[PDB]
C-alpha cells in the first residue's frame, strides 16, 4: 500500500514541478492535478487525527488553558453565529478603544516554537521548511495535532475540521471562476499544495530525522490541506522578543473574532510580550465582538480565508499598465515616471470605493497621455519638479486635454476587460437571485460579479470625469 501512494506522489511531484503551461491549458492542467489528488485522497482515510464530538465541546478547555497562561478570559464567550460561524460574544458592555483581549507569547504557535518542537531536526535538515515559514507553521500544527500531550492541544482541538478555501472546492464550483483573475491564484494555490505534499510525503518516508515524528506512520493529503488552510486562514505577522525581526504566529483566543469593516486595533506589546486587541466599537452585553482583519480584497478573502465579504470597502482588481516601447515619447515618459517614483510598467489596482484609481495610477495615466511639450515642461524648467510633484493630485491636472485623453483610455480599457469575461453582471445577479447554490458556488459567483462590478464602476467614473473635463474645456 505505501508503494502505490509513493508512485502516485512521484507522479504528482513530477506533474506539479513542470513549467507553467500556456494560457488555455491552465484549466486542463488544474483538472489533471485534481484527478491525481482525488485518487490519492480516495485511498487515504482523511485526517490522520480526529477528535470525537463537536467543536464547541472543546471551547471551555481552551478558555481554561488560556486563563492559566496569562491571557484575558473575562468579558467574552465562544458562541455559534449563523452568518459567521463560531466567534466571540460580549458578556459585558465593552467600550470602544477598551483593551479587552490579550494573549501572551507562550500560548502562540510560531516558527520559533516549531524550530524547538519535535519538528526541530527535520526543520534543520529540510530546505523548504527553512525557506517557507508558513509551510513550517503548517507542519508544526500537524505534528502537534498528532501529539497526544501537546501544549497547544486545547487550541488545536478547537480548530475547524474543514474550510471553504478553493482547496476544498468541487471542480464545477471552480468552473464558475473561469475567465477571472482570481482563478489563476486558485490554480497556483492548488498546484503549490499538491507539489508540496508530493515533496514532503517523500521526505517523510525517507529522512531519518522524521522517523520519531508522528507523521511517519500516517501523513495524508487531507492532513496537509487542513494544515495549510488553517495557517493561511489564521497566520499573523508579529515581532520577535527584541522587535528587530518579524515572524509568523497563530493567536489562539483572538483568532476566533470575525471580520467587519474598520481599522486595525491589534498590536504587539513587547514589554509585556503579548498580543493586545482593543474594541473596534462599543459592544454591549450579548453583542458579537468583531475586528477588522485587514485591507484585503474579496479575492484574497475567498482564497486565503474562505469567505466573501459583502460591502468590502477595500475591494479592488488588478490592471496591467505600461508605456509602450513603440511610443516615440517612451524615454521622456520613462524619465518622468522615474522622477515621480513610479515604474514605467507595473500592476495597479482599480478600487470600488472612491476614488476608483489611486494617486499612483492617476499620475501614471497622466504621464501616459502627455504630449511632447507637456513632457518637456515636466522634465525641464523651474516649475518642472512642482508639476511632477502634483502629478498624483486630482486638484492639479496637467491640462484639460490630458484629462480627457486619460479618462477616455481608462473607460475603453475597462470596457474591453469587461468584454473578456464569460458572463455579464446581470447574468450573475440573475443566478444569485433565482438559483440556490452551495456556499462555495455563491462565493465564486459573487467574486466574479465583484470583479466585473469594479470594472463597470470604473467605466462609469471614467465617463463622468471625461465629460466633466470636456465641459470645463468648452467654457
Amino acid at each position: 500500500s505505501p508503494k502505490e501512494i509513493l508512485n502516485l506522489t512521484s507522479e504528482l511531484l513530477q506533474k506539479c514541478s513542470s513549467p507553467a503551461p500556456g494560457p488555455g491549458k491552465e484549466w486542463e492542467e488544474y483538472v489533471q492535478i485534481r484527478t491525481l489528488v482525488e485518487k490519492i485522497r480516495k485511498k487515504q482515510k482523511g485526517l490522520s487525527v480526529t477528535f470525537d464530538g463537536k467543536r464547541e465541546d472543546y471551547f471551555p478547555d481552551l478558555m481554561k488553558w488560556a486563563s492559566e497562561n496569562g491571557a484575558s478570559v473575562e468579558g467574552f464567550e465562544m458562541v455559534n453565529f449563523k452568518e459567521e460561524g463560531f466567534g466571540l460574544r460580549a458578556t459585558r458592555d465593552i467600550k470602544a478603544e477598551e483593551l479587552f483581549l490579550w494573549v501572551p507569547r507562550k500560548l502562540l504557535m510560531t516558527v520559533e516554537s516549531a524550530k524547538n518542537s519535535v519538528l526541530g531536526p527535520l526543520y534543520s535538515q529540510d530546505r523548504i521548511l527553512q525557506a517557507m515559514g508558513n509551510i513550517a507553521l503548517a507542519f508544526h500544527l500537524l505534528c502537534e495535532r498528532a501529539s497526544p500531550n501537546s501544549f497547544w492541544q486545547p487550541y488545536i482541538q478547537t480548530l475547524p475540521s474543514e474550510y471553504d478555501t478553493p482547496l476544498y472546492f468541487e471542480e464545477d464550483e471552480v468552473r464558475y471562476l473561469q475567465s477571472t483573475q482570481a482563478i489563476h491564484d486558485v490554480f497556483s494555490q492548488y498546484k503549490n499544495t499538491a507539489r508540496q505534499y508530493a515533496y514532503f510525503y517523500k521526505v517523510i518516508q525517507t529522512h531519518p530525522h522524521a522517523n520519531k515524528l508522528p507523521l511517519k506512520d500516517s501523513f495524508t493529503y487531507e492532513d496537509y490541506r487542513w494544515a495549510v488552510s488553517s495557517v493561511m486562514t489564521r497566520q499573523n505577522q508579529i515581532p520577535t522578543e527584541d522587535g528587530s525581526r518579524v515572524t509568523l504566529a497563530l493567536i489562539p483566543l483572538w483568532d476566533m473574532c470575525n471580520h467587519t469593516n474598520g481599522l486595525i486595533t491589534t498590536g504587539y506589546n513587547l514589554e509585556d510580550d503579548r498580543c493586545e486587541c482593543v474594541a473596534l466599537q462599543d459592544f454591549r452585553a450579548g453583542e458579537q465582538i468583531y475586528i477588522f482583519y485587514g485591507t484585503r480584497s474579496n479575492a484574497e478573502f475567498v482564497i486565503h480565508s474562505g469567505f466573501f465579504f459583502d460591502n468590502n470597502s477595500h475591494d479592488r482588481v488588478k490592471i496591467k499598465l505600461g508605456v509602450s516601447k513603440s511610443d516615440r515619447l517612451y524615454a521622456m515618459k520613462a524619465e518622468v515616471l522615474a522622477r515621480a517614483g513610479i515604474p514605467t510598467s507595473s500592476v495597479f489596482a482599480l478600487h470600488f470605493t472612491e476614488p476608483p484609481i489611486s494617486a499612483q495610477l492617476l499620475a501614471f495615466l497622466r504621464v501616459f497621455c502627455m504630449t511632447e511639450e507637456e513632457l518637456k515642461e515636466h522634465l525641464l524648467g523651474d516649475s518642472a519638479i512642482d508639476r511632477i510633484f502634483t502629478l498624483g493630485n486630482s486638484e492639479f491636472p496637467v491640462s484639460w486635454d490630458n484629462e480627457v485623453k486619460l479618462w477616455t483610455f481608462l473607460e475603453d480599457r475597462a470596457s474591453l476587460l469587461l468584454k473578456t469575461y464569460k458572463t455579464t453582471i446581470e447574468e450573475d445577479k440573475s443566478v444569485l437571485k433565482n438559483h440556490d447554490l452551495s456556499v462555495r458556488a455563491k462565493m465564486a459567483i459573487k467574486l466574479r460579479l465583484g470583479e466585473k462590478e469594479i470594472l463597470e464602476k470604473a467605466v462609469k467614473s471614467a465617463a463622468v470625469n471625461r465629460e466633466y473635463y470636456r465641459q470645463q474645456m468648452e467654457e
Partner: peptide, 16 residues
C-alpha cells in the same frame, strides 16, 4: 499609534 499592527490572516507567498 500602534508600533506593531497585527493583520489577521495576512497573505503570504506559498510558492516555494
Amino acid at each position: 499609534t500602534l508600533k506593531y499592527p497585527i493583520e489577521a490572516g495576512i497573505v503570504t507567498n506559498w510558492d516555494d
